[PDB]
Every structure is written in structure tokens, then in C-alpha cells.
Design a protein around this ligand. Structure first.
Ligand code: SAH
Ligand code: CL
Ligand code: CL
Lengths: 254, 126
């Protein structure tokens, strides 16, 4: 394949883009201060760009090969085409348009914390469910899960992931307030961010039964005090802290 | 969710493939190329052969979202004016001869739309 490299952005180059396509371009890609136009073969163009031949990959194959099962003991997070031989609890998640593919440190932190804290039969709130990964994992561990999200786009994805796992968590649009009537819960798991944890702390307390657990992650290491200060002020007991990379998970007892 | 890339492409409606630019542009960040191709093509199925600007937002766990836009102004002017590839034959050839409202995102912005057409240089009737 060939690329024709032009100085400028797509915006700046707007008048010439139809001509690139009429010349045989199959698509355009804005890069740092350049537009790359991809053609099967070079053509004579009036635009003063530069022809460069690029190496032809099978991009589907390159992507499949570098996408590996994501281990988060006791779970392995697998794409639908993955095979697995180990004894781990499989979680099948399509890597798609919803956070929670299993390839985030925070998702993995929360998966391991679930295995440490979740009692069979207990009621679990997955706050900010995204792909559904954590609510599905909670079902696999013997819990009954409610997964909520304010983003309605993820809920059909979370549903379709639940079908890949033979489980049916309850999925719901909204936030903590919309989950409240389904509680109180035995366990809350929330991979969000520090500031939202600090704001919702007192409502976390109301969401949980006495002795209920809050597993909170999505917390940047340097933002952890905001959550510690807030969960103290809401009357929680600290159970453990867990770290991976620049991220932490903080566990609290009601 | 922390954004790791915002990828701007223009692709042919209904016709994304995993070949470049889609393959390398999404692949660089590990986004699901095949899932993008499918959603893109489903979302632009009723659009003919239009150029569709598309913005892909990729997250640290390889999840992504995308937004499609309205065809480029220059594309619309050209298509409405009869300008096409192929049949350039010896002898006579004819020059060419709303989009402002489709491309506006307040009022008579059609001033550098009628003007872009003349820089093209397409004759306007009224
Ligand atoms: N105030 C709020 N209430 C409910 N959900 C929220 C929220 N703010 C953000 N979210 C949702 O929280 C999710 C965070 S990404 C977390 C996805 C998944 N639980 C995982 O562990 O990987 C996003 O889908 C986002 O839409
Ligand atoms: Cl429920
Ligand atoms: Cl019920």
C-alpha cells in the first residue's frame, strides 16, 4: 500500500480531500501536523504531498495476537475467541465500546478484591458498571449483582457480556440514588475516581447494611487522601489497601 | 476513563475495512479494529458513498467510542455540482453548477459556501 503525506490537518486541508478520494484514496488519517492518505498504488496528484510506500500488515491478525487473556486471580478475563486451559474462573468480555475489558489495572484490582470480600449469597452493587465485568464476576462468586451506569450506551453491552457468561445481573441506568431501592447491599464495588468517591461517601454508608463492604478504586495514588478523609468522615472502618501502578483500591467496612 | 488517543479519520460510508488507516490507527492503541469497522459501517449504512469524518476516542484498557460527522463541505458542493471521476473524454467538457445548514455547526454562513464553490470554480445559478 502507498501513502500520500500532506502538511496540515484535515480541517486546514478540507478543499483537497474529495480529490484524494476521487484519485483512489481508501481513507484519511490525521497525524501530528500531517494528513496520511492511503492508496493501493501511487497516482499523479496536484496537491504537493509526498508518496511513500508502507509495509502491508494483516492488522486483524496483529491485533488478535497481541491481545492476551487478562489474569486477575481467581479470574481470567478472556475475549470471545480466546481459549484457556487453566483452572481460573473465566470472564468473557468483548473488547468493545465500554470500559471494563479487563485490561485496566483498576478493573483487575477490583476483581481481586471481590474474591477477598464477597460472601456467597451476598447482594452486590457494581457502581459504574461499564462492560458489566464486575457485576458478572460477582455473579460467578455466588452474589446477586446490580450493575448501574449513568451512560445508557454501555448497558446493552453489559447485557450482551452477561449472556456470554450465562449470568443475568440486574442492569440499570442511573447512579447510586437509582440503586438505593434495590438495597441495602452487602457489598459495593466502585471503579470510579477519587473525587466522586469523596462526594458519595455518606450515601455509600446508607447503601450498605451493617458490616457491608465498600471496595473503591479508580483512585490515583496522589488522590487517595481525598477518599481516606471522606470515608473516615462517613464513619467507615478501613479493611485493606491494594495498589497497582499509579492506582489504588481502598476497602472499607460499614 | 482517561483518554489515551483521539484518532481522526475520514472514511468511505459503509465501507470501512481493517486495512489502513483503520488498522494502524486503532491498532496502535490496541482498540478492537473489527468492532470499529462493524459499528462504523452499521452507523453509516444509509449514507451512500459519502466521505464520513470519524473521531475515535480510545481508553487505557483498549475500549473506545467514536463520533461520525457530516460530510466535508467541499464534498457536498462537488457532488451537488455533478463533479465525478472517470469519463474525461477528448473534446467538449462542461463546468459544474442548505449545505450551509448541514455544515453550519448560525445564519447566512453560505457566504464561504457559495464562495468556496466559485473558488472551485463551480457556477451558481441563483
Ligand atoms: N456518577 C456516576 N454514577 C454511575 N456511574 C458512573 C458515574 N460516573 C461515571 N460512571 C460510570 O462508571 C464507569 C467507570 S469505568 C468502570 C467500568 C467497570 N466497572 C470496570 O471496573 O472496569 C463508566 O462506565 C461511567 O459511565
Ligand atoms: Cl437487585
Ligand atoms: Cl428482584
Amino acid at each position: 500500500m502507498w501513502v500520500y503525506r500532506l502538511k496540515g490537518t484535515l480541517e486546514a486541508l478540507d478543499p483537497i480531500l474529495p480529490g484524494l478520494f476521487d484519485g483512489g484514496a481508501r481513507g484519511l488519517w490525521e497525524r501530528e501536523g500531517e494528513v496520511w492518505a492511503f492508496f493501493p498504488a501511487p497516482v499523479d496528484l496536484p496537491y504537493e504531498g509526498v508518496w511513500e510506500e508502507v509495509g502491508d500488515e494483516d492488522w486483524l491478525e496483529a491485533w488478535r495476537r497481541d491481545l492476551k487473556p487478562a489474569l486477575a486471580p481467581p479470574f481470567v478475563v478472556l475475549a470471545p475467541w480466546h481459549t484457556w486451559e487453566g483452572a481460573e474462573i473465566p470472564l468473557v468480555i468483548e473488547p468493545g465500546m465500554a470500559f471494563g475489558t479487563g485490561h485496566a489495572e483498576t478493573t483487575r484490582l477490583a476483581l481481586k478484591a471481590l474474591a477477598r470480600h464477597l460472601r456467597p449469597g451476598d447482594k452486590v452493587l457494581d457502581l459504574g458498571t461499564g462492560s458489566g465485568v464486575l457485576a458478572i464476576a460477582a455473579e460467578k462468586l455466588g452474589g446477586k449483582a446490580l450493575g448501574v451506569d449513568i451512560d445508557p450506551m454501555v448497558l446493552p453491552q453489559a447485557e450482551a457480556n452477561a449472556k456470554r457468561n450465562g449470568v443475568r445481573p440486574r442492569f440499570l441506568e442511573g447512579s447510586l440514588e437509582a440503586a438505593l431501592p434495590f438495597g441495602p447491599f452487602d457489598l459495593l464495588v466502585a471503579n470510579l475516581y477519587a473525587e466522586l468517591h469523596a462526594a458519595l461517601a455518606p450515601r455509600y454508608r446508607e447503601a450498605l447494611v451493617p458490616g457491608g463492604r465498600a471496595l473503591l478504586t479508580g483512585i490515583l495514588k496522589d488522590r487517595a487522601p481525598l477518599v481516606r478523609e471522606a470515608m473516615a468522615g462517613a464513619g467507615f472502618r478501613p479493611l485493606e489497601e491494594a495498589a497497582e501502578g499509579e492506582w489504588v483500591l481502598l476497602a472499607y467496612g460499614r | 476513563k482517561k483518554v489515551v488517543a483521539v484518532v481522526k479519520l475520514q472514511l468511505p460510508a459503509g465501507k470501512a475495512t481493517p486495512a489502513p488507516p483503520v488498522g494502524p490507527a486503532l491498532g496502535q492503541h490496541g482498540a478492537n479494529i473489527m468492532e470499529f469497522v462493524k459499528a462504523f459501517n452499521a452507523a453509516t449504512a444509509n449514507m451512500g458513498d459519502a466521505i464520513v469524518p470519524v473521531e475515535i476516542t480510545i481508553y487505557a484498557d483498549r475500549s473506545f467510542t467514536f463520533v461520525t460527522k457530516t460530510p466535508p463541505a467541499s464534498y457536498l458542493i462537488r457532488k451537488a455540482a455533478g463533479l465525478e471521476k472517470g469519463a474525461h473524454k477528448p473534446g467538449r467538457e462542461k463546468v459544474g453548477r442548505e449545505i450551509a445548514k448541514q455544515k453550519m455547526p448560525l445564519e447566512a454562513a453560505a457566504r464561504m459556501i457559495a464562495g468556496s464553490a466559485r473558488s472551485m470554480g463551480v457556477e451558481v445559478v441563483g
